[PDB]
Amino acid sequence: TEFKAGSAKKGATLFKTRCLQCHTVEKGGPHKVGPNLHGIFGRHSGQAEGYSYTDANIKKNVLWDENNMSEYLTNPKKYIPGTKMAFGGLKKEKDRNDLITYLKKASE
C-alpha cells in the first residue's frame, strides 16, 4: 500500500510506552481513558460500545484502514479537530509503520 510494513516487536514496545496508559488491545477489553482498540480495523470512527465519545470523533465517520490511521497518529487534533485524545504525535514514518503492523495483528 502507500504505507509499508515493519517490525511487530518494536510496535509492541511503542504501544506499551505511548498507548497502553489509555488503551488495551485484547477481546472484550476495558475502556480506560480511551476505547478498546480490538476490531478497530474495518470499523468506522466512534462505533465501539459502552463509551462516551466526543461529537467530533463521531461526525468524522471514517473507515479505519492502515492509511488514514497514519494521518491520525502523526497529529490527532489536526485530522479530527476537537477530539479528547491527548497525544503528541508520531513524527517518524518508521514509528508509525511498526505500530500499525502490531495493531493489525493484535486487533484482529
Binding site: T17, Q21, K32, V33, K77, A86, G88, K91, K92
Partner: protein, 294 residues
C-alpha cells in the same frame, strides 16, 4: 542600600530572531530524541530543570534564581534534590555549543518555555538578559521543596518565591508532565496518562480518582490510584486545603483559565530576582514548530 540587584543585560547583539533560533534547536531535538524515558521524551525534564534553577530563589536577599545560571557548577548540579536533571543538562549542552553566546540561565529557562509550548501548552512570554555569575554566588543545597509535606508547608515555601495560592496551584499543574522515578526522588509513577502533552489532567486526576496512601519501594509514602497514577503528599495537599481545593476545581473545569494563569506564573517563576531595564525589549512570544510548518 539594598539586596544583590541582578540587572538584565541582553547578550551583545542579539534580538528576537536569534532566540527563535535557539528555541527552534531545542524544539527540534525534543522532536528527534523522542525515545528518552520510555518515549516520554525530554520535554518534562526540561520544564523541571527550568523550575529547579528558578526555584532556588530567596526573595529576602535575592540569592538564587535563574539569573546566574549557577546550575553549571558542582554544588547545585550535585544537589540531591536535582537528581535526574543531569539528563536535561546533557540535552542542552550541544545546543549551547551551537549557540555559545547564550547565557546558562537564558538557555535553562528557554528550555522550559520551549518544552511547554512544544507539548501543546500555552504560549509563555520570555525575556532574555540573564548573566552568568562566578562560583561564589552558588546557592546552598536544600532550597528546593520537600515532597513529603503538607499544605501549610507548600504555602509557606512558595511565599519565599513570592507566589500566592492561585500561582502555586497553577504552577503545580506542570505535574501533568512526566513522572516520578524511584532512583531520583524515592517516588514512583506518573501523575497522569498524557505524560508529554500539557493539559489540565493534574487537577482532573486529583479530583476524579480514588486515592489511597501506600508505601513505595523506597519506603516513602505516596497517594496511589487504581488507574496506576500517583500524587506526592504535596500534590494531594492541594485538595486537603480548602482554599487550594477551590482553585484545583476551577482549573479542572476550565483548561483555558489554567493556561492563562500558568503562563503568567511560570514566566514570573523564571523571572524572579531579575530587574529588567526600561530600554530593554518587550517579552518574546516564540512561534512553535507547528506554526513554522513542522
Amino acid at each position: 542600600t539594598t539586596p544583590l540587584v541582578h540587572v538584565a543585560s541582553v547578550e551583545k547583539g542579539r534580538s528576537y530572531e536569534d532566540f527563535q533560533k535557539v528555541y527552534n534547536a531545542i524544539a527540534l531535538k525534543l522532536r528527534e530524541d523522542d525515545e528518552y524515558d520510555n518515549y516520554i521524551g525530554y520535554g518534562p525534564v526540561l520544564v523541571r530543570l527550568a523550575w529547579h534553577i528558578s526555584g532556588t530563589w530567596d526573595k529576602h536577599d535575592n540569592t538564587g534564581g535563574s539569573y546566574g545560571g549557577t546550575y553549571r557548577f558542582k554544588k547545585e548540579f550535585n544537589d540531591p534534590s536535582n537528581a535526574g536533571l543531569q539528563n536535561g543538562f546533557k540535552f542542552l549542552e550541544p545546543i549551547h555549543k551551537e549557540f555559545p553566546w547564550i547565557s546558562s540561565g537564558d538557555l535553562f529557562s528557554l528550555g522550559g518555555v520551549t518544552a511547554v509550548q512544544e507539548m501543546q501548552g500555552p504560549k509563555i512570554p520570555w525575556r532574555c538578559g540573564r548573566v552568568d555569575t562566578p562560583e561564589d554566588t552558588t546557592p546552598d543545597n536544600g532550597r528546593l521543596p520537600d515532597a513529603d509535606k503538607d499544605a501549610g508547608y507548600v504555602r509557606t515555601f512558595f511565599q519565599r518565591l513570592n507566589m500566592n495560592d492561585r500561582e502555586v496551584v497553577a504552577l503545580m499543574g506542570a505535574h501533568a508532565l512526566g513522572k516520578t522515578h524511584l532512583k531520583n526522588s524515592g517516588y514512583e509513577g506518573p501523575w497522569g496518562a498524557a505524560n508529554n502533552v500539557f493539559t489540565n489532567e493534574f487537577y482532573l486526576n486529583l479530583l476524579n480518582e480514588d486515592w489511597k496512601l501506600e508505601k513505595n519501594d523506597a519506603n516513602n509514602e505516596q497517594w496511589d490510584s487504581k488507574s496506576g497514577y500517583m500524587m506526592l503528599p504535596t500534590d494531594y495537599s492541594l485538595i486537603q486545603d480548602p482554599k487550594y481545593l477551590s482553585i484545583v476545581k476551577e482549573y479542572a473545569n476550565d483548561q483555558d483559565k489554567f493556561f492563562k494563569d500558568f503562563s503568567k506564573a511560570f514566566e514570573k517563576l523564571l523571572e524572579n530576582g531579575i530587574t529588567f531595564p526600561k530600554d530593554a525589549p518587550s517579552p518574546f512570544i516564540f512561534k512553535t514548530l507547528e506554526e513554522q510548518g513542522l
